[PDB]
Amino acid sequence: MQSLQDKASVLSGVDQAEAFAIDESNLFDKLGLQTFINLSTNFYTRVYDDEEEWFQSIFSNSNKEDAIQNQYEFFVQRMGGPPLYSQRKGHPALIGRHRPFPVTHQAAERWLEHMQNALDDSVDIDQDSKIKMMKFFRHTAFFLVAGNEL
Amino acid sequence: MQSLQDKASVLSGVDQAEAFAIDESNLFDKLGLQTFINLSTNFYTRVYDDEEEWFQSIFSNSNKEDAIQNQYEFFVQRMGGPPLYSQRKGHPALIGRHRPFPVTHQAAERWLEHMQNALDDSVDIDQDSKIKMMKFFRHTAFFLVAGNEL
Numbered sequence: 050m051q052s053l054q055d056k057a058s059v060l061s062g063v064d065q066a067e068a069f070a071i072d073e074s075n076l077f078d079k080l081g082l083q084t085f086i087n088l089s090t091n092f093y094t095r096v097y098d099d100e101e102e103w104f105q106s107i108f109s110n111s112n113k114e115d116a117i118q119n120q121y122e123f124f125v126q127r128m129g130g131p132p133l134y135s136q137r138k139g140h141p142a143l144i145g146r147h148r149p150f151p152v153t154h155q156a157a158e159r160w161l162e163h164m165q166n167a168l169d170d171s172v173d174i175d176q177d178s179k180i181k182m183m184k185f186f187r188h189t190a191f192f193l194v195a196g197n198e199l
Numbered sequence: 200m201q202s203l204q205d206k207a208s209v210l211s212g213v214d215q216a217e218a219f220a221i222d223e224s225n226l227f228d229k230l231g232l233q234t235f236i237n238l239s240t241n242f243y244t245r246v247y248d249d250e251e252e253w254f255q256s257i258f259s260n261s262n263k264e265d266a267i268q269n270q271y272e273f274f275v276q277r278m279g280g281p282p283l284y285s286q287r288k289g290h291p292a293l294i295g296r297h298r299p300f301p302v303t304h305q306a307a308e309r310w311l312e313h314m315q316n317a318l319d320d321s322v323d324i325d326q327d328s329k330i331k332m333m334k335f336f337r338h339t340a341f342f343l344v345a346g347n348e349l
């Protein structure tokens with residue numbers, strides 16, 4: 050309430066401080082490009098095989114392989130790697146770029162569920178990193194929810 | 200047209216490639232924190248002394264010293280320095296965070312004018328950097344205009 054990052058914390062239960070703990074060490078240096086590519090691939094397989102119509106139909110106007118490229122490049126860029134996303138698309142502008150979608154509370158949890166699963170399948174992400182990443186995903190999911198409202 | 204970064208290029212005359220040339224070398228390493236603090240201070244002095252009512256009244260609900268802190272921290276973060284902005288506020292989410300303001304074509308040029316002046320007064324920014332920075336400011340100003348429309 051009264052500030053996007055505040056709504057995100059209240060809704061998500063993740064403190065903004067926690068959310069950006071990713072910035073304390075270079076995760077990309079820890080995990081490498083391939084971890085991120087596999088992660089987003091896994092994630093989007095699940096999304097595009099999601100049987101939950103309402104979710105899934107959210108992604109109908111996008112290409113699976115494009116969305117994968119969009120996502121891992123943002124993650125690579127944002128977690129210590131080279132700025133691949135900006136090189137190609139400019140500012141992440143997450144709220145702006147999610148404007149066309151119905152980013153609801155329920156949708157945030159669905160998104161986060163597929164991601165939790167994709168993170169679990171990941172063979173190359175250590176616990177500490179998994180926690181930091183989920184804290185970041187979860188805070189920002191609800192940051193998007195807050196943005197979808199205002 | 201059809202894509203935020205495309206509108207920005209068409210309106211602004213700055214190719215998105217040009218806009219993100221800042222990512223080729225560490226500008227923060229070149230210029231240091233103080234350059235950025237002085238730059239934003241200069242800039243916001245001008246903004247808050249702007250006699251153009253319509254512009255200036257855009258910034259009425261903000262504190263001069265807060266806006267300065269917001270801006271130089273984003274620039275520091277985005278041009279090679281430590282992620283000060285995110286540490287404090289989370290995602291830059293530029294379109295989202297400019298939603299409350301009337302970000303018009305005319306406003307973009309005004310903003311860019313004060314910035315051009317502030318860049319000129321800067322004693323520690325070399326030509327090459329000035330060009331890269333203005334390309335980045337100008338592209339992103341119109342990216343914000345595009346965002347203000349859609």
Ligand code: HEM
Nearest residue numbers: 107108111115116119120123146156157160186189190193
């Ligand atoms: C709240 C639940 C969310 C929903 C329903 C959602 C939905 C979508 C959809 C439909 C797209 C377009 C796919 C594409 O063509 O690239 C997209 C793009 C994207 N999403 Fe999400 N998203 C959510 C949360 C998140 C979160 C938590 C992150 C980051 C941690 C994120 C980052 C992105 C990025 C980087 C893109 C690509 C932007 C672009 O290049 O256009 N999203 N999202």
Ligand code: HEM
Nearest residue numbers: 257258261265266269270273296306307310336339340343
């Ligand atoms: C298009 C012309 C623009 C107008 C009229 C405009 C207006 C504003 C206003 C009124 C604020 C709130 C001040 C504050 O309290 O921090 C603001 C914040 C900000 N603007 Fe702009 N702006 C423009 C373009 C830009 C450009 C080109 C950039 C980056 C290159 C930028 C980056 C920011 C940032 C980082 C903030 C602080 C966000 C926050 O923490 O809430 N703006 N802008």
Ligand code: NA
Nearest residue numbers: 140142292293
């Ligand atoms: Na942004």
Ligand code: NA
Nearest residue numbers: 142143290292
């Ligand atoms: Na953003």
